[PDB]
């Protein structure tokens, strides 16, 4: 009932960014916050009803618009690296805040470093299988920038959550390169069955359609990149 779009965005310094919030709660109040480590959430702009907006605590460099009860937009007319953050919108009736899912925004100096991950699936050790009757598969995503990614595991075409541990934050490998790892652990019997299909998927959020890409190499658009393995006896 509170939906933000886009959920991820890469912008260049000096560019324009608009984040939209659409609510179905029929709440009179709406809010735009950003979240930054050491600051919790800080209110940028808010609105007490359709047709008007109010400056929050840190409004500088942002504008807002409330054209209807349902919609509350945050506008960055001239993006700066300082605006790199996670943005949350919320609606409110009677004091309680109902938050959107969050938007990751990266404002970069140029788009040339944006790059999708290389995804590798490392197969279980035979020693682990022999000694513990368990099989840990490890997925490694390397070489990506910025860090707008989601890693998920798919077993037999269905997303799995039990037996999975993913790094909660991507590791900066070098100045313009991140990595992320994850493990899926299954029983030896499950790994040993030829019917079973295992796939690690990384959703990389990158450039959109309107973005200029002046290279011979592939445009780093939003895309899923995966690696897979089949069970074996």
């Amino acid at each position: 009932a509170v939906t933000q779009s886009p959920r991820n965005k890469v912008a260049v310094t000096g560019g324009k960014v608009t984040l939209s919030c659409n609510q179905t709660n029929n709440h009179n109040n709406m809010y735009w916050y950003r979240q930054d480590t050491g600051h919790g959430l800080r209110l940028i702009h808010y609105s007490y009803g359709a047709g008007s907006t109010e400056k929050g605590d840190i409004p500088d460099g942002y504008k807002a618009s409330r054209p209807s009860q349902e919609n509350f937009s945050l506008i960055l007319e001239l993006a700066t690296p300082s605006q790199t953050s996670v943005y949350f919108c919320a609606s409110g009736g009677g004091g309680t805040l109902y938050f959107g899912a969050g938007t990751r925004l990266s404002v970069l100096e140029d788009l040339r470093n944006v790059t999708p991950p290389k995804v590798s699936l490392f197969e279980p050790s035979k020693a682990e299988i022999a000694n513990k009757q368990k099989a840990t598969l490890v997925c490694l995503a390397r070489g990506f920038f910025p860090d707008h990614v989601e890693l998920s595991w798919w077993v037999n075409g269905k997303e799995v959550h039990s037996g999975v541990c993913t790094d909660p934050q991507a590791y900066k490998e070098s100045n313009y390169s991140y990595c992320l790892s994850s493990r899926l652990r299954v029983s030896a019997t499950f790994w040993h069955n030829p019917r079973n299909h295992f796939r690690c998927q990384v959703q990389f959020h990158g450039l959109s359609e309107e973005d200029k890409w002046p290279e011979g190499s592939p445009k780093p658009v939003t895309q899923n990149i995966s690696a897979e393995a089949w069970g074996r006896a």
């Binding site: 959430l41 490392f122 840990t136 490998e173 652990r185």
Partner: protein, 189 residues
Amino acid sequence: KTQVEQSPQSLVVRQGENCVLQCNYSVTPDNHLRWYKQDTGKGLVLLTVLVDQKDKTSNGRYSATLDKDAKHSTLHITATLLDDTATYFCVVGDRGSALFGSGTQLIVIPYIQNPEPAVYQLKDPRSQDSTLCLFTDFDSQINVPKTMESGTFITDKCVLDMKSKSNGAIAWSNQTSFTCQDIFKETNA
């Protein structure tokens, strides 16, 4: 200068332990004070709302207090679960005047009754000579080493739950020489 401060800033506690989070503020008006929980990459979830000059609330394993004279609040989590791992925010005031504290990062770690620490080398079949080390099934107090070498990387402990629990860390390197034995300096390589 921030008007809402929280303690502890961070803490790592063993599963089943109780913990107490604290908040104090200098903000006026303070008609309401609320505690929110935020999980890794998630939105915020309201845990309790305190309103009276001296107030006390109960919500399952959560209990909270408010002393508006001292401008002080506490949130008590009884018998922590691994799923309590999150950031807890104190939020003072209402609507456009509400102010968030910087949060308390809580991590809850399990008791491993029978650790069987082992280091395994795994191979990527799509890349010749590409391998990685998996350190697994070690106890919760064990320190996972940070990289002291260029081109080598080691992850932070990640707690996995099969639905038993296992601690794990991963390491990889682009160095011809170094193997799994010298990376994880515990046992069973």
